[PDB]
């Protein structure tokens, strides 16, 4: 026991010893003399009574925490309180009740504060598995609240991966204990929130976002050998764990063994049935010889040997034969070879899929990335070249074609001659190819020292498509001037310049915000150009601005939150542009309201 | 004489000759205890050889990959046989029922780990022969410990991997080896509760085709009256007598054989199904309006109540076709409506159109009980068909 004027002296001693570690900074990364004094300060307070040390550390822990945000070596204080003490559960309780309050702003702070908070959480979890028989009962209250509040606070967080990182650290800190039975009342909500975050990143962040979610969805702690009846929640991340991440593989294989060893082979076989072809096809990729790791190959051999005929009774003839998409087709031009009398036709697209994979990956060297970008723009400008020629009187023809929209009953000269058909497969492949190249021009603005020429080329392409839209406007009067005309003349079959109606809603729905900014800049630019070449009174009824607006409403009805964000971005820039006229926003009010209401219902 | 034959050919090695070398090392560990544990090295070099052979093949699954999968199972059974023999070498102090549980667990894992029935008979034969080697080792090592016990722990469950082989060759239309494999079962002269079961069942199913052989199935069952540890084997014996007697032209004696096959248990649905087939074969020489068909539909309805989770839909087809006769006497409706048992409501789903066009046909209100039991348990199967045929009949009134 102590009096009041003795515990005041002990509080001031702890305060001055924590302040005095500022003399020994640089001027778990601390200097040797500061580490020695932190060992002295930790050992000094170990033999004090626990009932006074608890109130000293509880009154001092916010000040110790705000001193940790300047000299980060003071974590070696708290570690030395909970790695070896007779009063380790008490400090673990004080620290967990402090971090429970600090958890709400764990996402919305900078890198230093989030780093310090994650290290305090990691220390508090390692204190549990360092002393199992001594109190881990300090952790089992506010354990489900930790999981639930991390999942809830990651919704409105600015950096929402720190919460998942925390759930991963908590799962990797435990396993082999008793308190995984109060945790079994959280498994369905955790696994639905993990699978519906696992596959809803169809435009994944490109970091460890997919790896983190599939690492969380498997490797949950279950007291029973087979975790739960909630095993079909694990079948879709098991395919990703075996298939796409070679550092998750040795985890997921272990999970398979835990299902293959004791599941009775009757209950388990309908569960793996929707995934057995993907599971076996990713398992067959891991059967590689000795330069590849034999610790994860002999696992696959053991699994496939423990399954007698069950490793091959569910495979049929292959239903996945690749049918030569737009990343596989040839666009053929003539090249002059010096050893030949005439030019020779060869394909300009043998490295499109490779150049897209080079451009997408951050790791590749800038020279390779810049040459890949130059290759894609070469193929794209070759596809755009044979419409880039303009007549000598294009200004008066454009003016005539834009004031000829406001006339009624345009007489159509009739002629009786057939046009050739479309060949839908080659048209679809060329359309998707132009779309992929335009989308990579939009993606190129997310890279420094590729952004300036990408923005210049994008401005040229956008005000080219704005000038090509007037042909589609003039040809949509073939749908009028005669309610059934069959004897008219149409230009045969081309890329109809309505594939900027699939690229600008792509750029708004993309998972880099720096290209969503380029998407809204693209919409502002085509708004300016469409108001320029038409006039404001009819650019809202005939130009891109009505048409693309309908696309924005269609983005509100999609089945993932990326396209809904793109739709509300397009709707917000639309209703910030058009407010001077009261015909467009009042004509389109019901559909816009239903779209913005469907974003609220379905999300 | 086998080691020299292996060593002369175990250059430019294949996975098969490597498997033979690993089995020779395993037998060296088996017959001479405190062996080598180079079996743990030969299995690993065989796994690496098989992985090189797997990468040498195409990426997508070819039929050649099936033998590599069988080789993986053979190496894992080699390692489990190493564990079996290591447990078998420490039970020399007569520590039975303490280490026999591990042997029983690995043998029970082996009984459920057998290839698919459409796989090659060389695959089946290879697994059967090397499991017979692994069983011969434990039968040799339990042989000194027999008289010192004073049934017993000498297994001789080799008969299992004979019988399961002798079944599957009969699936592969190889009846000569299916008869010839039921001759290596006489290594122990006792009648077991399951060896005699599959032995007599497969020997009676041998003489079912090639109709100059049915008398050889008749004379082998008709003289065996001592029960081979069971009261269900005599019922299937009696209905197999019914099959063999009804295969030749016999009117009443085959009916008597089916009656004495069916009175004993009332729990074998194969007897009910074969009695229904026999009544249909008697029906096929006359018009289908004779009230003898009520016996056929009663044996069919009994043959679908407890024959569940199987191929019963042809019995339901026979019911739907034999019901549709135009008899004036109400004997068939009695035979349907006095059935005491639970009708397989889920298997009546696949004939929902043939039920729903049976309401328009007359002499059919016993279809209504089936459709009512469908609608109260499986409501989404009937709904679209009901609305379609309802709006069909509603516009023709």
């Amino acid at each position: 026991v102590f009096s009041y004027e003795e515990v005041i002296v002990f509080k001031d001693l702890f305060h001055e010893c924590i302040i005095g570690l500022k003399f020994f900074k640089d001027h778990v990364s601390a200097t040797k003399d500061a580490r020695e004094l932190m060992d002295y300060l930790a050992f000094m307070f170990m033999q004090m009574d626990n009932a006074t040390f608890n109130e000293i550390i509880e009154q001092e822990l916010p000040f110790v925490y705000e001193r940790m945000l300047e000299d980060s070596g003071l974590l070696h204080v708290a570690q030395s309180f909970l790695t070896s003490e007779i009063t380790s559960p008490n400090f673990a309780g004080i620290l967990l009740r402090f971090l429970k309050g600090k958890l709400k702003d764990l996402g919305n702070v900078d890198f230093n504060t989030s780093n310090v908070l994650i290290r305090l959480f990691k220390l508090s979890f390692m204190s549990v598995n360092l002393f199992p028989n001594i109190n881990e009962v300090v952790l089992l209250p506010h354990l489900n609240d930790l999981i639930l509040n991390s999942l809830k606070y990651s919704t409105t967080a600015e950096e929402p991966l720190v919460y998942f990182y925390l759930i991963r650290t908590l799962f990797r800190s435990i396993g082999g204990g008793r308190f995984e039975n109060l945790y079994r009342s959280i498994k369905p909500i955790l696994q639905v929130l993990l699978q519906s975050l696992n596959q809803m990143i169809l435009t994944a962040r490109l970091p460890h976002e997919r790896e983190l979610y599939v690492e969380l969805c498997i490797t949950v702690p279950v007291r029973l050998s087979v975790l739960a009846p909630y095993l079909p929640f694990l079948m879709k991340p098991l395919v990703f764990a075996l298939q796409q991440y070679p550092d998750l593989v040795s985890q997921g294989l272990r999970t398979l063994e835990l299902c293959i060893d004791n599941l009775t082979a009757e209950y388990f076989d309908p569960i793996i049935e929707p995934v057995i072809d993907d599971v076996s096809k990713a398992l067959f990729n891991l059967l590689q010889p000795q330069p590849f790791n034999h610790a994860i190959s002999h696992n696959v051999v053991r699994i496939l040997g423990k399954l007698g005929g069950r490793n091959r009774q569910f495979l049929k003839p292959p239903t996945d034969l690749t049918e030569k998409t737009e990343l596989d087709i040839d666009a053929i031009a003539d090249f002059k070879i010096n050893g030949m009398p005439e030019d020779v036709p060869l394909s300009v697209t043998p490295g499109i899929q490779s150049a897209l994979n080079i451009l997408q990956s951050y790791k590749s060297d800038i020279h390779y990335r810049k040459s890949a970008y130059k290759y894609l723009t070469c193929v794209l400008l070759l596809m755009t070249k044979s419409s880039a020629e303009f007549p000598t009187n294009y200004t008066e023809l454009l003016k005539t074609a834009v004031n000829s929209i406001k006339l009624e009953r345009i007489g159509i000269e009739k002629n009786f001659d057939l046009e050739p058909t479309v060949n839908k497969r080659d048209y679809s492949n060329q359309e998707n190819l132009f779309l992929r190249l335009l989308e990579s021009v939009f993606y190129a603005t997310s890279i420094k020292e590729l952004k300036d020429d990408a923005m210049d080329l994008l401005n040229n392409l956008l005000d080219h498509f704005c000038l090509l839209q007037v042909n589609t406007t003039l040809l949509n009067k073939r749908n009028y001037n005669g309610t059934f005309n069959i004897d008219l003349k149409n230009p045969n079959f081309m890329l109809d310049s309505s594939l900027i109606l699939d690229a600008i809603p792509f750029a708004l729905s993309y998972y880099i915000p720096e290209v969503r900014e380029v998407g809204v800049l693209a919409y502002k630019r085509i708004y300016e150009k469409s108001c320029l070449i038409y006039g404001e009174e009819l650019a809202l009824s005939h130009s891109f601005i009505p048409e693309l607006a309908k696309q924005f409403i269609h983005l509100c009805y999609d089945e993932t939150y990326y396209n809904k964000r793109g739709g509300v971005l397009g709707i917000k820039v639309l209703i910030d542009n058009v407010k001077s006229s009261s015909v467009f926003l009042k004509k389109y009010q019901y559909n816009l309201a239903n779209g913005l209401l469907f974003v609220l219902k379905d999300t | 004489a086998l080691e020299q034959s292996v060593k002369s050919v175990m250059d430019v090695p294949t996975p098969r000759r490597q498997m033979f070398k690993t089995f020779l090392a395993l037998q060296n560990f088996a017959e001479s205890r405190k062996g080598d544990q180079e079996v743990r090295k030969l299995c690993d070099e065989g796994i690496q050889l098989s992985l090189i052979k797997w990468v040498s093949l195409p990426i997508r699954y070819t039929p050649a990959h099936k033998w590599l999968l069988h080789g993986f199972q053979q190496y894992m059974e080699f390692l489990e046989a190493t564990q079996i023999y290591a447990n078998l070498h420490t039970t020399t102090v007569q520590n039975l029922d303490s280490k026999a549980q591990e042997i029983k667990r690995i043998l029970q894992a082996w009984r459920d780990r057998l290839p698919n029935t459409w796989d090659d008979v060389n695959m089946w034969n290879d697994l059967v022969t090397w499991r017979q080697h692994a069983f011969q080792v434990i039968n040799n090592a339990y042989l000194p410990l027999i008289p010192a016990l004073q049934a017993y722990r000498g297994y001789h469950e080799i008969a299992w991997v004979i019988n399961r082989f002798a079944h599957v060759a009969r699936k592969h239309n190889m009846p000569d080896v299916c008869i010839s494999q039921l001759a290596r079962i006489y290594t122990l002269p006792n009648i077991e509760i399951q060896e005699a079961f599959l032995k007599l069942r497969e020997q009676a199913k041998c003489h079912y085709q090639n109709m100059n052989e049915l008398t050889t199935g008749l004379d082998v069952i008709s003289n065996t009256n001592l029960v081979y540890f069971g009261t269900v084997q005599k019922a299937e014996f009696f209905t197999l007598k019914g099959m063999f007697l009804s295969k030749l032209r016999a009117y009443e004696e085959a009916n008597q054989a089916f009656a004495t096959a069916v009175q004993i248990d009332l729990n074998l649905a194969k007897a009910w199904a074969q009695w229904g087939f026999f009544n249909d074969r008697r029906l096929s020489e006359e018009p289908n309006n004779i009230s003898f068909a009520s016996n056929a539909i009663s044996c069919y309805l009994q043959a679908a109540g407890l024959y569940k989770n199987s191929k019963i839909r042809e019995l339901l087809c026979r019911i739907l076709w034999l019901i549709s006769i135009d008899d004036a006497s109400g004997m068939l409706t009695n035979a349907f409506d006095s059935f005491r048992g639970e009708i397989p409501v889920w298997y009546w789903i696949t004939f929902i159109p043939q039920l729903l066009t049976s309401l328009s046909h007359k002499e059919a209100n016993m279809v209504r009980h089936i459709l009512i039991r469908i609608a109260k348990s499986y409501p989404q199967a009937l709904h679209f068909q009901l609305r379609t045929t309802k709006e069909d009949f509603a516009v023709i009134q």
């Binding site: 050998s225 087979v226 293959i260 060893d261 004791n262 599941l263 009775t264 082979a265 209950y267 010889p289 000795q290 034999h294 610790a295 002999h298 696992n299 053991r302 040997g305 423990k306 | 430019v12 090695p13 743990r40 090295k41 690993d44 070099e45 690496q48 050889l49 090189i52 894992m76 390692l79 489990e80 564990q83 591990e102 667990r105 690995i106 029970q108 894992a109």
Partner: peptide
């Protein structure tokens, strides 16, 4: 019903060292 008993645990090796075979003129 849902669970079966424990399978025999086959211990895979940790430090196996096999030789990559030289190609042959087969």
């Amino acid at each position: 019903a849902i669970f079966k008993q424990t399978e025999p645990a086959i211990p895979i090796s940790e430090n196996i060292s096999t030789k990559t075979p030289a190609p042959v003129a087969y």
